[PDB]
Amino acid sequence: VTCGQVDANLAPCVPFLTQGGEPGAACCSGVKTLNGNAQSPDDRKTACNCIKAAANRYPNLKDDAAQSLPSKCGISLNVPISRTINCDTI
Template identity: 55%
Template sequence: MKGVNVVIIISMLVVLAMVQLSFMARPGEAMTSLTCEQVGACLAPCIPFLTQGGEPSSKCCEGVKNIKASTPTAQDKRDACECVKAAANHLSNLKDDMAAALPTKCKVQMDIPVSRTTNCDTLN
């Protein structure tokens, strides 16, 4: 039953990703106040990497870059961090080591960790 829940969550995130594509920032274009749905859409392509390992897809890394570009202020980072944290808590099979490695694997210096336990209030 646990596997079915993961499949349902992944399916919902993929649908959100498709719906939210029009809201994602394009390279060089900053967007503020990402919604949790938009953060989820950015990270949806990363689910296979976050749960199984391997290498993140180019779509995954594009989403990570979009989050970085769309969170220029400390408050934007804290808000997006809370969304990332909530999404991470919904993935019961999230591999913490893969989550921690995601920005490095995507060659992005990101201030928002993918973690279930981050204290988002400390981000600046």
């Protein structure tokens, strides 16, 4: 797992994450790929810190969208999209 791959997986989600609505197919596919790469505990912690950087990057991140992304995409997301998550706890 690298932060560049994480950034790529999350790129189609930026509209949903910053404006609300629905994630859409491309966003959910990217998130599913990311989740499938964040399976081991170390992959999980690494992806988590990358995602934290991404969440802080996006202007006007909507916390409702970030919190709703897993259920809207149908995934048990192993790395929540959060600007503040303590990745040691993941």
